[PDB]
Design a protein around this ligand. Structure first.
Ligand code: 73B
Length: 115
């Protein structure tokens, strides 16, 4: 599975946002939400499709994203699930916003899909 130049750039961004350098922002997003471990009420009444950084990596590296936009859709899904479930004043949403801002700045530099 050889990725396009755009999706290789996406892989590098994903690695960067998932890295130890941002651990205080990303640790909440590394692995799937586990309703039992986290004590959550009503999570899947609010969130239709869960997403997290490990799943994004699996999907990217197994060829499930055809364009950089498919990849970005799942990054945004992950963040939006967090905001909508937890509320934007929650601690986790606040760090999410910081991580998303880093993602957005870097994703704007990814080349065209056909290059
Ligand atoms: C992303 C998201 O929306 N949620 C989420 C996901 C993972 C973890 C989590 C992840 C790893 C650990 C750990 O390494 O121990 C602990 C909690 C925690 C949460 C959120 N819980 C939480 C986050 C911050 C604070 Cl100060 C208190 C509670 C719940 C939410 C569903």
């Amino acid at each position: 599975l050889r990725l396009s130049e755009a999706l290789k750039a996406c892989s590098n961004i994903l690695k960067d946002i998932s890295s130890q350098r941002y651990r205080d922002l990303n640790h909440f997003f590394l692995k799937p939400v586990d309703v039992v471990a986290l004590g959550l009420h009503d999570y899947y009444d609010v969130v239709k499709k869960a997403m997290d950084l490990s799943t994004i990596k699996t999907k990217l590296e197994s060829g499930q994203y055809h364009t950089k936009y498919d990849f970005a859709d799942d990054v945004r899904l992950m963040f939006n699930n967090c905001y909508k479930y937890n509320g934007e004043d929650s601690e986790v949403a606040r760090v999410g916003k910081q991580l998303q801002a880093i993602f957005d700045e870097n994703f704007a530099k990814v080349p065209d899909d056909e290059s």
